[PDB]
Ligand binder design. Sequence first.
Ligand SMILES: NC(=O)[C@@H]1O[C@H](CO)[C@H](O)[C@H](O)[C@@H]1S[C@@H]1O[C@H](CO)[C@H](O)[C@H](O)[C@H]1O
Ligand SMILES: [Mg+2]
Length: 138
Amino acid sequence: PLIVPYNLPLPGGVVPRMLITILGTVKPNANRIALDFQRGNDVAFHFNPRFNENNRRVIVCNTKLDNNWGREERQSVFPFESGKPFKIQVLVEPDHFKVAVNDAHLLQYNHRVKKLNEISKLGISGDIDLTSASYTMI
Ligand SMILES: NC(=O)[C@@H]1O[C@H](CO)[C@H](O)[C@H](O)[C@@H]1S[C@@H]1O[C@H](CO)[C@H](O)[C@H](O)[C@H]1O
Ligand SMILES: [Mg+2]
């Protein structure tokens, strides 16, 4: 597979029509998963499934600028399960990242970072076995 945390370079950053695909399997008794689309030290798009925040599962999304987290966007629809294989597709659209899991639409996250072509790395971390991570222009 791939060693986690995993760094996927995004050459020339991202752009609308760019589709990023992350394939792996949630570990048993998972606590968290994170995708971090970074512009240098900033995090343009943080996508963070939490398996046990006050005994609830929640996906937390956010942006980090100059080392400071902004306002969280939270989604209680939670398609992940401990022990099960997943696919995350992040499609960059003009105004938002569009995220589907296992071919079902999950959430959109509006662009806060405007310089899309400088979002040049994806960090993939957490309680997963990572099989593959890649991108394609659609
Ligand atoms: N930024 C925080 O420390 C926040 O703490 C409160 C509790 O006071 C909540 O736990 C909140 O979710 C964050 S935890 C923090 O969240 C960012 C995303 O906003 C990211 O997931 C980071 O890894 C977490 O430490
Ligand atoms: Mg910007």
